[PDB]
Design a protein around this ligand. Structure first.
Ligand SMILES: O=c1ccn([C@@H]2O[C@H](COP(=O)(O)OP(=O)(O)O[C@H]3O[C@H](CO)[C@@H](O)[C@H](O)[C@H]3O)[C@@H](O)[C@H]2O)c(=O)[nH]1
Ligand SMILES: O=c1ccn([C@@H]2O[C@H](COP(=O)(O)OP(=O)(O)O[C@H]3O[C@H](CO)[C@@H](O)[C@H](O)[C@H]3O)[C@@H](O)[C@H]2O)c(=O)[nH]1
Ligand SMILES: [Cl-]
Ligand SMILES: [Mg+2]
Ligand SMILES: [Mg+2]
Lengths: 606, 605
């Protein structure tokens, strides 16, 4: 009785990625006798099928089958679903990987709460978030929130196999379609799936390669909007719950239809803009009710209005007025305190991190700044930000540079003010203070030695700016906290990074060394090297080593000796143990804690 | 009867650079009967000597001579100076050029005021200024200021030949030559030269190339500092007036000795740092008197005190703390009013255009923010800025992108405030308002069709930040002012540029067209294309042409037509006068005013 079936459609699969896929499944904490691997090759030209069988040689739970090419992943996933015998199915693409505890955590979460779909936290290579809303907390009763509980609607979730089979839930392969994972997840919810969200552990890594697509399907504007029309018609005809239908109509109208009416207009030729604008206008009139836009922000209500009027020229004019609106955060102070790293940051809305972004106070109204030729074409309520000045968000986030996983940094406090800069003009300014407990984000053992990058997420007046936290001054601060070496620093791009476990930087080199305070107890053979500036909390002992070379003998072998990085009584030191090495004269001394050597140029005389 | 002699030392000269040099000499407004060219070739490995003899065949006023290679430009200039016959000598290098009206303006200024040296405005390829202080106004009595009137001490000035001969002022001839033009200018002032500054017209273009400033001295630390000791010994031995000695001592101590104790410490290896620090310490103790440090700003006093204490570790920490301090200006407003373009800018001292730079208030002192380890080692007055919160400057400037010439924009009002942001911390914020009268900077004819780049200059607390003016939002605004097409815009690098004369952009393209208000007339064959967004001041009548080409023809060869951009009242228009040419049909209309053609998709049938 198999707990999990891994459905993997392959087609001309790149060999290295296929090997990484196999290693990520082999390293599951779940016992191998309790999951199943089903690979369906979709008529590959490469030796992919031969290699899939070569992989299946060593695995009594991996099944491989070859069919002729179907042009997409829908057909192989459906056949593999009919071949599977596990309780839950994971649709794993041939270029992705899975985190090592995914199978065990997901199944126990699904079995305990009797879930039909488990939406586990998904990681993507690029970006500072993915599912920032939906992956914010575990929710075993997520389907009570509505169909939103399945976003983002990738197919990389865990589905109850008998639920799919009893409701005839398959990927649309009889027709050629984009967003097949959106159809698949919506059908799952329409038939009443009990959904749970597992957000406290990264379950799936969706990897950005360089060859994600090479087909003629979807690249032209006519096929694109044919697919968009088919998706909206699918919602209006199949979603029976009014709340769920309104969510899907609002979410997809805002992102894919109104989404071409902003900066997109500045990145495309007039021939393409004219084609897509007419399609979008026609869809709004034909499929999108007027009430959908009443629950949108002021800016999206402006785009919706001008779209239905065919006033593309005003939209182009608005795209240029809006070009560059953003909110970058600067570090006001960064310091360690007890076992945490503390930050104080500040931001404001600007054009491209330069002059201030402004709104106007006219009478009792807080208005968007527009030329009077634009304001004379719009309902006056659509550029009035009065009822929106308290809807600002300002939050920190972190991202592991190895795992690519992103997390919100909890416990932060912020405050956004609408301040009168000059005359009747108002700028928007934010301040925020937060701390980082690095253990919150260390889930796999690999996470203990990793660089982390800090970012801030600012939303308001309809704009969203999620950008790396930055600092102008040189920032280098080290800490030895409960056996964790930590270095917060301005990296070479001017952004804020945090190294933990000497992944990229040397804590001895960044702390400095009191050279004139080095002690040499030659009877015990112990060389003590006090570190200069370092925040030490708790007791630490990190084993490492060091290298000695006789000065002047430039070709000499390193003399390998043991070393210890010690934190105690809020001081840090490196102790080098000479041991049985007989030494006489001056020597270069280089410490090697956690695989990172210092550049302090230490010389001792023995 | 020669007014100017042009001394040109040559050595393996690039042909194109020499041809440009010869071209800029021929362009002089002065009649060639009143100037001469004296070339001394320092024994070139290339054909440079035979190229010089070729240009001198057609010009009777050019003398060419070759010598054995001396290794530097000092000896060839000295030899050309003995054979020159003019009243004034200009030392011109084999990779530079001269502005068209230099000879005439310099001689007239020098002869009117009986000057031994005319220090004319020098222009460099890179940077937003050159001689920002000395080249700020004309001064026929510049020697009243002291030896400072000759900075920057390049050899690219005009020297009365009789004055050089009578005082035996020659270029330093040696096997190891460095800053020879500093000695030459200093010796000129030591011998009591009447100096005049010609600031209102750019006289010399010192060009940067791919082969500049590559020699053993200045590339090797031991020879570099041996030359620095020669220069300071020269100052104390030869300069006799205390005012001039104090200036040269302070200037060169600050810039070349203390100048390695800042950001230089973060760009060099510890081996070279130790070598040059010990040289700098020994030189400060032996050649620089103690009172010299009292002429310096607070940050330089700190560097001087820690240098004499040999405290390199504190200096390295201070450089780390100081890294990135700057001041970037943003456009708060930019608009055309009357005949000028108006700007409202703002700035604050920051680290790399990010978080604020702060100073800290304690009791009655405005202190630099420093760690206690360093504050404990410093005299208390040296990190107290309170006496220096008054001496901020905030000024605008312009640079011609073709001529490379830089100018200060006058008439601006600015205000720098020290603002208590939070707690006891104080930031430094400045506001500025200025206008641009482009006729101020149009001197030569080529200056009419040029891009102009705008910059701001901020100084205070010992920092100097001269950087391009920048804007984030899309900025495109056009103007037609007294027969001038002017377009202020954000360029491809996010900086403020002003195109005058359509050197980059089509003013019709950026202005828009009232398409429905196109007045047609077969009575005279003149169509009228009104312009939408443009600031029109005064009457304008620009000349140009246009084309007419039908729709959808394979080998469509257009027909050329006359066009005129008209500026009348507060509105602007294009008059594509046809008269008599072709027949009818659906054609296009691409105007071509001042060599720039619009792309607004105009069709007339
Ligand atoms: O003719 C084909 C083409 C693709 N595939 C399979 O389709 C999957 C996705 O292909 P991939 O190269 O990973 O595309 P991506 O763009 O990275 O994948 C995203 O976009 C796809 C297209 O919508 C979705 O199917 C995926 O779930 C989604 O992660 C893989 O298992 C392939 O083997 C086939 O089996 N046959
Ligand atoms: O063996 C040589 C080498 C150079 N030169 C001349 O030296 C002059 C300056 O050299 P250049 O190639 O122009 O270099 P730059 O770095 O541009 O020159 C700057 O730096 C020089 C060294 O201080 C000064 O002499 C110059 O005036 C100054 O413009 C030119 O006229 C050369 O022909 C010679 O006569 N003989
Ligand atoms: Cl440009
Ligand atoms: Mg993929
Ligand atoms: Mg040169």
């Amino acid at each position: 009785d198999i707990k999990i079936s891994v459905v993997v459609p392959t087609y001309n699969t790149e060999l290295e990625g296929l090997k990484n896929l196999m290693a990520s499944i082999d390293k599951q904490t779940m016992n191998p006798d309790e999951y199943e691997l089903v690979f369906v090759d979709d008529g590959s030209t490469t030796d992919t099928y031969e290699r899939l069988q070569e992989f299946a040689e060593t695995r009594p739970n991996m099944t491989v089958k070859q069919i002729e090419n179907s042009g997409w992943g829908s057909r192989p996933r459906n056949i593999a679903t009919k071949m599977a015998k596990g309780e839950y199915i994971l649709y794993l693409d041939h270029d992705d990987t899975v985190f090592p505890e995914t199978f065990e955590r997901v199944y126990n979460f699904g079995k305990e709460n009797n879930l039909d779909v488990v939406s586990g936290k998904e990681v993507r290579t690029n970006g500072w978030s993915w599912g920032w809303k939906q992956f914010s907390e575990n929710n075993p009763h997520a389907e009570e929130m509505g169909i939103e509980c399945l976003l983002p609607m990738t197919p990389h979730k865990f589905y109850k196999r008998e639920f799919l089979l009893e409701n005839d839930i398959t990927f649309d392969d009889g027709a050629r379609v984009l967003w097949e994972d959106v159809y698949f997840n919506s059908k799952a919810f329409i038939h009443g799936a009990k959904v749970g969200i597992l957000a406290d552990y990264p379950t799936y890594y969706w990897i950005a390669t360089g060859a994600n697509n090479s087909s003629s399907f979807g690249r032209d504007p006519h096929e694109k909007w044919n697919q968009i029309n088919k998706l909206f018609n699918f919602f209006k005809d199949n979603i029976k719950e009014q709340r769920d239908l309104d969510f899907m109509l609002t979410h997809w109208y805002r992102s894919r239809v109104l989404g071409i009416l902003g900066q997109w207009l500045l990145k495309n030729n007039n021939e393409r803009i004219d084609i897509e604008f007419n399609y979008a206008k026609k869809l709004a009139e034909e499929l999108i009710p007027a009430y959908i836009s009443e629950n949108l922000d002021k800016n999206n209500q402006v785009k919706d209005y001008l779209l239905r009027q065919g006033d593309l020229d005003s939209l182009k004019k608005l795209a240029q007025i809006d070009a560059g609106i953003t909110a970058l955060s600067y570090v006001e102070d960064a310091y360690f305190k007890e076992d945490k790293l503390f930050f104080k940051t500040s931001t404001k809305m600007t054009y491209e991190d330069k002059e201030d972004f402004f709104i106007e106070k006219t009478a009792d109204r807080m208005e968007r700044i527009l030329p009077e030729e634009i304001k004379s074409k719009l309902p006056k309520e659509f550029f009035d930000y009065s009822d929106d000045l308290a809807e600002f968000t300002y939050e920190p986030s972190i991202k592991g540079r190895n795992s690519r996983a992103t997390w919100k940094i909890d416990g932060s406090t912020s405050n956004v003010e609408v301040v009168n800069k000059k005359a009747n003009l108002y700028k928007i300014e934010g301040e925020m203070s937060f701390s980082v407990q690095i253990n919150d984000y260390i889930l796999d053992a690999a996470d203990k030695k990793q660089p982390w990058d800090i970012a801030t997420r600012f939303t308001g007046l309809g704009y969203t700016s999620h950008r790396a936290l930055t600092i102008g001054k040189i920032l280098i601060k080290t800490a030895l906290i409960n056996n964790k070496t930590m270095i917060v620093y301005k990296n070479a791009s001017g952004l804020i990074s945090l190294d933990v476990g000497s992944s990229v930087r040397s804590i001895v080199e960044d702390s400095g060394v009191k050279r004139e305070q080095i002690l040499i107890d030659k009877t015990s053979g112990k060389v003590t090297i006090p570190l200069n500036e370092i925040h030490v909390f708790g007791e630490s002992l990190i084993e490492g080593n060091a290298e000695l070379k006789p000065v002047g003998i430039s070709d000499a072998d390193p003399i390998n000796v043991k070393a210890k990085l010690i934190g105690e009584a809020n001081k840090a030191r490196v102790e080098v143990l000479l041991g049985d090495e007989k030494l006489s004269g001056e020597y270069h001394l280089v410490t090697n804690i956690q695989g990172k050597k210092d550049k302090q140029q230490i010389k001792i005389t023995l």
